[PDB]
Swiss-Prot record:
Entry comment on modification after translation: Tyrosine phosphorylated by the members of the SRC family after exposure to a diverse array of extracellular stimuli such as cytokines, growth factors, antibodies, chemokines, integrin ligands and hypertonic and oxidative stress. Phosphorylated upon IgG receptor FCGR2B-binding.
Family per similarity comment: Belongs to the inositol 1,4,5-trisphosphate 5-phosphatase family.
Free-text tissue specificity from the UniProt record: Specifically expressed in immune and hematopoietic cells. Expressed in bone marrow and blood cells. Levels vary considerably within this compartment. Present in at least 74% of immature CD34+ cells, whereas within the more mature population of CD33+ cells, it is present in only 10% of cells. Present in the majority of T-cells, while it is present in a minority of B-cells (at protein level).
Lineage, highest ranks first: Eukaryota, Metazoa, Chordata, Craniata, Vertebrata
Function: Phosphatidylinositol (PtdIns) phosphatase that specifically hydrolyzes the 5-phosphate of phosphatidylinositol-3,4,5-trisphosphate (PtdIns(3,4,5)P3) to produce PtdIns(3,4)P2, thereby negatively regulating the PI3K (phosphoinositide 3-kinase) pathways. Able also to hydrolyzes the 5-phosphate of phosphatidylinositol-4,5-bisphosphate (PtdIns(4,5)P3) and inositol 1,3,4,5-tetrakisphosphate. Acts as a negative regulator of B-cell antigen receptor signaling.
Record protein name field: Phosphatidylinositol 3,4,5-trisphosphate 5-phosphatase 1
Gene expressing this chain: INPP5D
Organism, scientific name: Homo sapiens
Quaternary structure annotation from Swiss-Prot or TrEMBL: Interacts with tyrosine phosphorylated form of SHC1. Interacts with tyrosine phosphorylated form of DOK1. Interacts with tyrosine phosphorylated form of DOK3. Interacts with tyrosine phosphorylated form of SLAMF1/CD150. Interacts with PTPN11 in response to IL-3. Interacts with receptor EPOR. Interacts with receptors MS4A2/FCER1B and FCER1G. Interacts with receptors FCGR2B and FCGR3. Interacts with receptor FCGR2A, leading to regulate gene expression during the phagocytic process. Interacts with GRB2. Interacts with PLCG1. Interacts with tyrosine kinases SRC and TEC. Interacts with c-Met/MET.
Domain remark from Swiss-Prot or TrEMBL: The SH2 domain interacts with tyrosine phosphorylated forms of proteins such as SHC1 or PTPN11/SHP-2. It competes with that of GRB2 for binding to phosphorylated SHC1 to inhibit the Ras pathway. It is also required for tyrosine phosphorylation.
Amino acid sequence: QPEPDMITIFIGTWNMGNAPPPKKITSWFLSKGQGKTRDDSADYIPHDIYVIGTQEDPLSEKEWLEILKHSLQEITSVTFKTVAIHTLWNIRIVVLAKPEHENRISHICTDNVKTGIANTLGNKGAVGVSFMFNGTSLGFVNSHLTSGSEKKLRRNQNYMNILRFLALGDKKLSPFNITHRFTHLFWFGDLNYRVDLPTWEAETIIQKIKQQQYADLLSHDQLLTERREQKVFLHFEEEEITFAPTYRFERLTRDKYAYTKQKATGMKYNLPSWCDRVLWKSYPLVHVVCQSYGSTSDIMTSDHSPVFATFEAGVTSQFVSKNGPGTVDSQGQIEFLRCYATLKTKSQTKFYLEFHSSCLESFVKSQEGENEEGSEGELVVKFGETLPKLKPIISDPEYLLDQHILISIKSSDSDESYGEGCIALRLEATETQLPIYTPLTHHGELTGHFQGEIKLQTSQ
Ligand SMILES: O=C(C1CC1)N1CCN(c2ccc(F)cc2)CC1
């Protein structure tokens, strides 16, 4: 039975509004309702992995697992295996997989982050799960960020705290946060970003939603505007939104948006908004294709509608050769030529690089680079032809061309990372000097760039 080179992944996010679900929620897992929906002809085809994020979830883990498993069994006639479940307060993540995947899945990690301080610590934050699927690392984050139209900067701060402090994936990747640890990272939840239009325009917005005219609303969506200004979710993707705002509904129908200020809302307006979102970030040149992104129309117990997204994702096999794992394969090598880092820092320490990859037996430290002053007042760190030749464990091009090298640029004085990035080995040619490039980030914000050339030798 062959190992897959693609899987499909279902991502669900639902703020349940502290109410139990209705008896039937199958529409969610079938990607049916509004937006980019799944074809009816696929209804019986199970996804490989289902990742369910809830917020304001009033159920026990046991109660929700029973509902999820019985839902999927009704759709697919398959009894899914529970990979992981993790709950912080009323924020929960469940990962389910087809039984045939049980011995393909390992290194399961869970963690949570509590956001805020004092007043603002106690109900917002994130949960996450990571694991290996054969040769591919997968990470999943469900976050419930700060509410309220006038708190976009708090939401951005919540995002930075979650990506700094959520401890998932390979702990040996010490310079890297979750935005670099995974082949594929999915980040979803009630992100709570609002449509920033005046309160007086509520009925106008409602009119536009009834006409299915979302363009003048999406141009004021805080998540899209903050992402375009590089304030949050740098280097993440989101499918185009083609479904109505998923908040705030009157319960037990979808015919009414409940936007007016009430004692129950702290006298805040809740203009119709796309609070409930799915974003992703995959390593360069790995296959990832969104095949659905939408909301259900028939699940009305909450003041939010459930959101679904599905993806094709490239995966690789657990490779064995005569040589690696457990030794190098002298027929393979990675050379970095004429490399330089450009950093936004004011610091004048010397810097060195670390190269991390699961194609190496362990990470590789470079010599210090040569600092020059850039024309427009930046730091340029030159490595020239001084970088260590990297010795992969396996030389087979079917393996090596699918790998990635994570790069950290670290201060010699403090050994702290000033920037992290990733280079694909999916090159146009081997034995050939080719340009490489990554942006560098630290705590998920842009700190610089790394560019130069690579020369990859495989056994072929
Ligand atoms: O406690 C252990 C022992 C290794 C320490 N496991 C629990 C999680 N396991 C799991 C794997 C795939 C899967 F799809 C579901 C569950 C198996 C391994």
